[PDB]
Amino acid sequence: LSSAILSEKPNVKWEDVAGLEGAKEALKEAVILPVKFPHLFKGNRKPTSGILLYGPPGTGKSYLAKAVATEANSTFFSVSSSDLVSKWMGESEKLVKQLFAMARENKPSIIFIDQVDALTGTRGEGESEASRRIKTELLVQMNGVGNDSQGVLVLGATNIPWQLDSAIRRRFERRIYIPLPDLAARTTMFEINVGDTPCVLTKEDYRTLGAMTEGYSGSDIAVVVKDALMQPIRKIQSATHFKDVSTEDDETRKLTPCSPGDDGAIEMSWTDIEADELKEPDLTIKDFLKAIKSTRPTVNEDDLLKQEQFTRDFGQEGN
Template identity: 60%
Template sequence: MYSNFKEQAIEYVKQAVNEDHAGNYAKAFPLYMNALEYFKTHLKYEKNPKIKEAITQKFTEYLRRAEEIRAVLDDGGPGPAQNGDAAVATRPKTKPKDGGGEGGDGEDPEQAKLRAGLNSAIIREKPNVKWNDVAGLESAKQALQEAVILPVKFPQFFTGKRRPWRAFLLYGPPGTGKSYLAKAVATEADSTFFSVSSSDLVSKWMGESEKLVSSLFQMARESAPSIIFIDEIDSLCGQRGEGNESEASRRIKTELLVQMQGVGHNDQKVLVLAATNTPYALDQAIRRRFDKRIYIPLPDLKARQHMFKVHLGDTPHNLTESDFESLARKTEGFSGSDISVCVKDVLFEPVRKTQDAMFFFQTPNGMWMPCGPKQQGAVQITMQELAGQGLAGKILPPPISKTDFDKVLARQRPTVSKADLEVHERFTREFGEEG
């Protein structure tokens, strides 16, 4: 029953967009309002959070457009400027391509539904990860810059037979920064960034998954230059012909192959970026579509040293440069994610010390800090007692020290095994290149 509300809403939206484009604002306004009512009712019943989010986004878009039209109608003007930025920004993307003739009626609501489902894949906010935040991986960063930034900023470089790279596969052990690198690309590139997971593209409805893949590439071409990032691509594109392969997954793979081939389309400005922890699980035809396959290895000594500094940030600490070097030497075999977890744990050490402390001293600026009994000015008191005296806001944990790190590292082990590394190194020798 409730799916009728959505279909009814889409029908009203189509009519509203047609009237809007024709400049009949007095007719478009009530149609938008009807659509919004139906969308609102549908949202009450919709259980799928992805669809809910996509519909809410559309709802906001149409509401904004309706408000613009109402403002103009109230002023008695002819209507919002068709070429104005605001009109373009809120122009619904689901508008019928041919003015909504009889033949297109069955097609457009379906297309609108697929696009609404994929809309949440577009990253509109920049993740704010700069190239410098990514430790090491110089050749991977250089290759991505060649593919992503140069073609947009310096299109004149790519003339004759020189073409930018079209598909990148980032592979390596878990936690080495493949997705982090993709975030840096999203921040630094002046492109539309689509970040999709396998769950975005797999539908329980027969035949819908490959339409989603096709719609994704269509949206990327329309908003080029754009980047499609597929995380954990192995879950979508395992080896064909395996016993546990479903009919749906075979069709997704075929559609992905066709779209990546780009037959009949101008895909010069669409870059596909994918990440996997298990490159051998990938179907070989898919693997061949990635013209750049870059190994993202465990961080080296210098990169680990940089990571400790980045994760500590501006948290008060008293570590010297040689302390950071010594930490990097002690964490041979740690992945970027292992170091992140280690620092997260260390950040709580001063808090634990403050909670357990029996003695505190008062700093010159009136703050209370934990200390040993022999410290000059030490007062025997606990954190709870200080808080009881109304001094909760005056308690300060001590700065992080090297011993805090030693304590945490004594109980932490790297998560990537030697066998894992050997698999990736073998794949690099056969098919890849070093990052």
């Protein structure tokens, strides 16, 4: 009957969300400011009902949705455009009706439709057959809630905003463009995870490597991080001949990963090695070089020409 999707409590703060200040401003203004001071928004003015995030994949749109949901002080409705039901003799609209309707009585609430471009058909697709009932139903019901309930937030996280129909995006309110990460943002994104190996060289090297690794997405950064995690393990693959860097005064000889060519190295059962005698090497520049060697820029120039054209004619902020 209901089939309601649960909303967990993820821990992503504003300090974790690196870069893009204007979006943060828009979101605080959108949700946090009316929660902080409600009597200001009265009479004529009403809060932003339909905020649109857009950009290429892996850039932290879902991550920002989760971030807002962390510091919401409110309910949430996580849902994908495709993943609930899709074409079974029609009827994928009742789900929407129960979604919005059950968001009405529970005031201050945040809806999130992941990838709205999947609903609309660019050539024909389901939009010719039965998905017109979806596109219509969303189009009508999104405005009917803000007419009745007054200020129920719907957050757009589309990848393809220009194939998307013009009728949806004019009913949907202000836009938020997501460009590629900049100096400070990429920099801080390196020092979030791990932190057991006590840093690397000074922050100038994070900027040098940063400018070398500029143009990467958030997922690309995550993959770099994962690579760096796996680096000492692939250094363990090459070893099987363990040297002790420290002295013999400790409880056990600290086994470092290294080749047999280096002196003072001996072999043993690598499977049955305890954690205390293990020791990771320092994270070298070759981590970033292996990252580079994975064929990086998914964000190519010719594809995002359209992104930046559909950007500039509306711009920062928007509808």
